[PDB]
Scaffold this active site. Structure first.
Site, PDB file in Angstrom:
ATOM      1  N   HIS A 136      28.006 -80.252 -21.022  1.00 15.45           N
ATOM      2  CA  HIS A 136      26.937 -81.143 -21.101  1.00 15.45           C
ATOM      3  C   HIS A 136      25.888 -80.255 -20.316  1.00 15.45           C
ATOM      4  CE1 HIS A 136      26.074 -85.912 -20.759  1.00 15.45           C
ATOM      5  NE2 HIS A 136      25.389 -85.197 -20.409  1.00 15.45           N
ATOM      6  N   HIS A 186      21.469 -81.203 -21.250  1.00 11.60           N
ATOM      7  CA  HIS A 186      19.960 -81.185 -21.456  1.00 11.60           C
ATOM      8  C   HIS A 186      18.950 -80.073 -21.972  1.00 11.60           C
ATOM      9  CE1 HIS A 186      21.020 -85.942 -22.405  1.00 11.60           C
ATOM     10  NE2 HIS A 186      21.343 -85.262 -20.720  1.00 11.60           N
ATOM     11  N   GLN A 195      17.858 -91.166 -26.754  1.00 13.27           N
ATOM     12  CA  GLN A 195      17.641 -91.430 -25.251  1.00 13.27           C
ATOM     13  C   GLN A 195      17.220 -92.713 -25.158  1.00 13.27           C
ATOM     14  OE1 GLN A 195      17.549 -89.476 -21.869  1.00 13.27           O
ATOM     15  NE2 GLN A 195      17.649 -91.291 -22.192  1.00 13.27           N
ATOM     16  N   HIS A 244      26.930 -90.809 -24.363  1.00 17.08           N
ATOM     17  CA  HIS A 244      26.671 -90.997 -23.216  1.00 17.08           C
ATOM     18  C   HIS A 244      27.165 -92.280 -22.685  1.00 17.08           C
ATOM     19  CE1 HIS A 244      23.966 -87.083 -23.164  1.00 17.08           C
ATOM     20  NE2 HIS A 244      23.415 -87.337 -22.190  1.00 17.08           N
ATOM     21  N   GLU A 300      26.669 -94.750 -18.461  1.00 13.39           N
ATOM     22  CA  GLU A 300      26.347 -94.201 -16.903  1.00 13.39           C
ATOM     23  C   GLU A 300      25.183 -95.063 -15.977  1.00 13.39           C
ATOM     24  OE1 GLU A 300      23.437 -90.105 -15.874  1.00 13.39           O
ATOM     25  OE2 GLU A 300      23.394 -91.555 -18.066  1.00 13.39           O
ATOM     26  N   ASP A 328      24.695 -81.172 -16.552  1.00  9.30           N
ATOM     27  CA  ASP A 328      24.052 -82.038 -16.738  1.00  9.30           C
ATOM     28  C   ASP A 328      22.914 -82.186 -17.170  1.00  9.30           C
ATOM     29  OD1 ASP A 328      23.640 -85.901 -16.083  1.00  9.30           O
ATOM     30  OD2 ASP A 328      23.290 -84.357 -18.526  1.00  9.30           O
TER      31      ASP A 328
HETATM   32  N1  LIG Z   1      21.544 -87.878 -16.340  1.00  7.74           N
HETATM   33  P1  LIG Z   1      21.951 -88.373 -18.563  1.00  7.74           P
HETATM   34  O1  LIG Z   1      23.013 -88.268 -18.903  1.00  7.74           O
HETATM   35  C1  LIG Z   1      20.033 -86.674 -18.175  1.00  7.74           C
HETATM   36  C2  LIG Z   1      19.583 -87.606 -18.889  1.00  7.74           C
HETATM   37  N2  LIG Z   1      19.307 -88.622 -19.993  1.00  7.74           N
HETATM   38  C3  LIG Z   1      20.199 -90.056 -19.563  1.00  7.74           C
HETATM   39  O2  LIG Z   1      20.579 -90.912 -19.946  1.00  7.74           O
HETATM   40  N3  LIG Z   1      21.583 -89.257 -18.501  1.00  7.74           N
HETATM   41 ZN   LIG Z   2      23.310 -86.144 -19.865  1.00  5.47          ZN
END
Ligand SMILES: N[P@]1(=O)C=CNC(=O)N1
Ligand SMILES: [Zn+2]
Ligand SMILES: C[C@H](O)COCC(COC[C@@H](C)O)(COC[C@@H](C)O)COC[C@@H](C)O
Ligand SMILES: C[C@H](O)COCC(COC[C@@H](C)O)(COC[C@@H](C)O)COC[C@@H](C)O
Ligand SMILES: N[P@]1(=O)C=CNC(=O)N1
Ligand SMILES: [Zn+2]
Ligand SMILES: [Zn+2]
Ligand SMILES: [Zn+2]
EC number: 3.5.4.1
Lengths: 422, 422
Positions: free
Chosen positions: A58, A60, A153, A211, A214, A310
């Protein structure tokens, strides 16, 4: 042309071992009677630990290395992070994305990581980063097997043309379908978004990595839909729920009920300790919750869970060198997995468990597998974790692709003395 | 005979600097016009950061390296840790203590630590470890200035002859008086124990460092007595409250009232992030509190707070290489001090703030001070913390006492490339 790795330790095995290579594969693994002398076409593990490569389940890569551009995430929250990223996403170019992604990928190669799953934001009518990342995947393939997640996103239902953009990303070649149900405008959009995600994954035959929850909201329970849909479709192995930080805040009775489904569904879990400890608990005063998912309980229940990094120097995390042993160190502390055996076995959370999460088939130190392996200058998992060792050698297809000459420390007392921290 | 340090960066200063040495002291600090060439009697900082030495304001050298002997701390709690230690304390010998203490001290020297405050358990009619540690203090003095705290692990009032043993430890030469009010049988013993501690410190003219409210109990408020007694006696600078983890669980109104006293009293605070994250929150299910004291708020209020390692491979902590940058890394994450400036300034929490806690007079990069300094292969505090750099050189009295040749990493792509993680 390496034919052999000599003087190798293997987790859970006694003494030293010789690993024979042939045509980029592991041909045989044989116990040694003692320390062997170096020979031509041999790589000396120097009694270090040999394991399959680290995995990053995981990250980005489209956002990496952008922290502070054009503004900093002041509050250190998920939600402001997304706002800061939206500002930076408006400035993205093809070359910008490829340059930053490669910067982090090189650190990963240096850190013995040969398998990487990157999320890429597809809430973008131009799909700029997604298309650039499809190129990077091909470019880095000799060193890293890169999976790309089409990550919406800004939501599937809550962003203009979100669903069409997500499907176009899959048509273009994304390996995994993402979602973000807790960020959708309503709980109903959140649930519906998962139905659309699973429908797309079945239509294109792709993996799923959501995701999921979170957020420090005890009412965020999208994970039960992810698991139920996986179970219904019989596709557990292909499905991952990332973060699930809301689970840190669930009552125990609901969690117990849920765990039956999580086990039956066979889905995977990713916890991201470095980022979770930073972004979670931000709406508490004192006391402040830790905010990592129920890793200890998952392990006790035989549910597959693993650790990701992450973010590396981006709107959600101002640090990082893309180091999985550092991630593991944080995870063991925050999750209180601090028994000797738990720490020693910790390597599993950044190797084998993560390989399962990525649905990898050619992984592990075994005859017949590709010769993909790394060597740590450490006696066992506990030692590697305690001393935060670098990767001595990274071997891929039987070729060395990275090496670190370890630091050398000396103290000058009554005479010079070497310090190994052992 | 070093006469100069060249090509040095200094925190908060531009460009490079030359540091002149004379008779084991810093004679002058002058800006450089550019990168200077190496000359005889010069130490090349190689454009690395020069800071005063790391400080360890809180460690237990008498317990170090005993984890698992004869049993492991299964629950990972403070309270079981004390039971496990009691079993090991019964097996202590003079040589055993000195050997283990020196093992950890050598790691500390290698890590650029030149000032160490160790607590030693004086709940022991033989005072075996205390007497051995008084010897170690003299033996290590060329490399580390060691302070010894007479620490009544099992209580002053709650252990047989506890008060007499504590006073005998001071008579023998302990630098600091300890206490542990939350471990005393009753709140009343806890409060009375602090009165006895302060009376002893005034009688022998010593420092005070209390293990204060190391417990997830919102009713544990011994810190207010420590601060009030310090204020009454006008001795704030000489007084430290370690841990104060209960403060993590106080209501906000009481904390606000308390902070007025904490500021007026001028006492110091030590937080121990590696150990606190492990031992605290152990009686929660979910959510689980972090359990570190209110570091962020203290800093905002101008209250002196710093970070210690606390334990190295012992009943309370199964890990450690005695590395202060690692402690700092954990502290910044758990306390959510993750702004760029906060991270960059983080070095203060393991240098200057800790020197104040130990009441040090000869500390800092300034003309007239002893030439005690370390060189980090990093551009600034943020870089050092992010990359977890080793100490390139440690200089004491103008002599090099430790050095690390940094690791060298290379990836083999289309050509070999050096990786610096920058
Ligand atoms: N902390 P993360 O996994 C990184 C980018 N965008 C997100 O919504 N969560
Ligand atoms: Zn992420
Ligand atoms: C250090 C790093 O951030 C830049 O490396 C250049 C790099 C060149 O790509 C070549 C490609 C495979 O055709 C990748 O690294 C070198 C190769 C040999 O692995 C990527 O540069 C991106 C630009 C061109 O937008
Ligand atoms: C590696 C470590 O754990 C042992 O070192 C031996 C050491 C010898 O002490 C000599 C003294 C100053 O008189 C300290 O290290 C070497 C000196 C030169 O700094 C301490 O040994 C403890 C025994 C004797 O119980
Ligand atoms: N965690 P710590 O500071 C170490 C030893 N004994 C204690 O009471 N507390
Ligand atoms: Zn292109
Ligand atoms: Zn002696
Ligand atoms: Zn302590």
């Amino acid at each position: 042309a390496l034919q052999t790795i000599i003087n190798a330790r293997l987790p859970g095995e006694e003494g030293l071992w010789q690993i024979h290579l042939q045509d980029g594969k592991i041909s045989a693994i044989d116990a040694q009677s003692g320390v062997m002398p170096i020979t031509e076409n041999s790589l000396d593990a120097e009694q270090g630990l040999v394991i399959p490569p680290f995995v990053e389940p995981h990250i980005h890569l489209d956002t990496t290395q952008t922290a502070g551009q054009p503004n900093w995430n002041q509050s250190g929250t998920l939600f402001e992070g997304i706002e800061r990223w939206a500002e930076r996403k408006a400035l993205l170019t093809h070359d910008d994305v490829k340059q930053r992604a490669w910067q982090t990928l090189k650190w990963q190669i240096a850190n013995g990581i040969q398998h990487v799953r990157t999320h890429v934001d597809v809430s973008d009518a131009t799909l700029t980063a997604l298309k650039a990342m499809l190129e990077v995947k091909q470019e880095v393939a000799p060193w890293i097997d890169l999976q790309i997640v089409a990550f919406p996103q800004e939501g599937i239902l809550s962003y203009p043309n979100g669903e069409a953009l997500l499907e176009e990303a899959l048509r273009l070649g994304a390996d995994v379908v993402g979602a973000i149900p807790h960020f959708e405008f309503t709980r109903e959009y959140g649930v519906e978004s998962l139905h659309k995600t699973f429908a797309l994954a079945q239509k294109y035959d792709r993996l799923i990595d959501v995701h999921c929850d979170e957020i420090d909201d005890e009412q965020s329970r999208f994970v039960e839909t992810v698991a139920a849909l996986a179970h219904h479709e019989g596709m557990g192995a292909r499905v991952t729920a990332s973060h699930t930080t809301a689970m840190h805040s669930y009552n125990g009775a609901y969690t117990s009920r849920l765990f039956r489904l999580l086990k039956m569904s066979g889905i995977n879990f990713v916890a991201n300790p470095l980022v979770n400890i930073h972004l979670q608990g931000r709406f508490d005063t004192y006391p402040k919750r830790r905010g990592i998912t129920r890793v200890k309980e998952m392990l006790e229940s035989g549910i597959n869970v693993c650790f990701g990094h992450d973010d590396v120097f981006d709107p959600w995390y101002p640090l990082g060198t893309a180091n999985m042993l550092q991630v593991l160190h944080m995870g063991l502390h925050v999750c209180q997995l601090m028994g000797y055996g738990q720490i020693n076995d910790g390597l599993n959370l950044i190797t084998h468990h993560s390989a399962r999460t990525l649905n990898l088939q050619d992984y592990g130190i075994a005859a017949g597998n590709s010769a993909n392996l790394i060597i740590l200058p450490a006696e066992n998992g506990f030692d590697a974790l305690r001393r935060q060792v670098p990767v001595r050698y990274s071997v891929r297809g039987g070729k060395v692709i990275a090496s670190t000459q370890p630091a050398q420390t000396t103290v000058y007392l009554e005479q010079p003395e070497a310090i190994d921290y052992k």
